[PDB]
């Protein structure tokens, strides 16, 4: 159940395999990619180096072939991508999407529950 990642913006993110449907019930990687595409200027602007990993960890979640419980990113990955960029959308009449919320994300502190995070 691990298809190779085909979404262009999600190349070089640390992992190369994903599963569908994702949390947003996208049927194919074409459906999700058209929603991640909207962020590629935000990535190119580089308002947050964690924005790259955060989106892909949500739209193209990691598909470990050994391990079959969903691995989400930590809330810290979201809070850095948020506050690092969120002012940019806020200045120009856009808004941090409700899909990219950080509140209910698994914290890095909890030792039971995993969540991906680099630095």
């Amino acid at each position, epitope marked *: 159940a691990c298809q190779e990642i085909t979404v262009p913006l999600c190349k070089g993110i640390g992992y190369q395999y994903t599963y569908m449907p994702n949390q947003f019930n996208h049927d194919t990687q074409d459906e999700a990619g058209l929603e991640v*595409h*909207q*962020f*590629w200027p935000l990535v190119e*602007i580089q*308002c947050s180096p964690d924005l790259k990993f955060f989106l892909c960890s949500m739209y193209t979640p990691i598909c470990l072939e050994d391990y079959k419980k969903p691995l989400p990113p930590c809330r810290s990955v979201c809070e850095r991508a948020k506050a690092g960029c969120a002012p940019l959308m806020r200045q*120009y009449g856009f*808004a941090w*999407p409700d899909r990219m919320r950080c509140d209910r994300l698994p914290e890095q502190g909890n030792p039971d529950t995993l969540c991906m995070d680099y630095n």
Partner: antibody
Amino acid sequence: EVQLVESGGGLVQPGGSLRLSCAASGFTFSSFNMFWVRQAPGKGLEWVAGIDDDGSYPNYGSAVKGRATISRDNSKNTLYLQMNSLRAEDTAVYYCAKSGPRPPHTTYWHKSIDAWGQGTLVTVSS
Amino acid sequence: ELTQPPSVSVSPGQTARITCSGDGSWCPFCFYGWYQQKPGQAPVTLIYLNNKRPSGIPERFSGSLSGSTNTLTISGVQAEDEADYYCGSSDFRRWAFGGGTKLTVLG
């Protein structure tokens, strides 16, 4: 096959009124945003009016605000543009322009121009 | 507030590159579109969402993004590619178009 036909173009006296109508086909009309873009003869494209899918949030350009009103009626697949107090600087070819693909169920998305009508010339002369 | 070169000259078979960018206040994370206007014809969109081709546009037209600058790339330029190429951008509040670029095919 996407088709956007603009009617109602012709002569309008200065300080007069204008009503344009764009008839859409080949696509689900109510599923895309809709814009008016004009081009004065020999000049560049200029942003005029824009509207959402249902018609709750009209958007207008600088040289147009307060004088124009964009609207749609998704029953007969028609877009409209009304204008008042037309000056000479309003003579232009007026284009009907369809929106491109948008990701559903998200509040973050950007507009694009997917299709253009053939345009109708509006001459502002006495 | 979109700027693009007034004119680009290329030889048949060569590759033309037209650049579009936003000024010191334009939405730096917004997308760029490209529309081709052949003489006397209505505009036709080649590129939307920075590097996407609508159905029917040939694949020799391509878009690329670098910072706040998009580049339209036309490979295998033929004399028929003579046209005005306008770029456009939207920040959800308004639209902004560039002055246009005239493509002349030399020779």
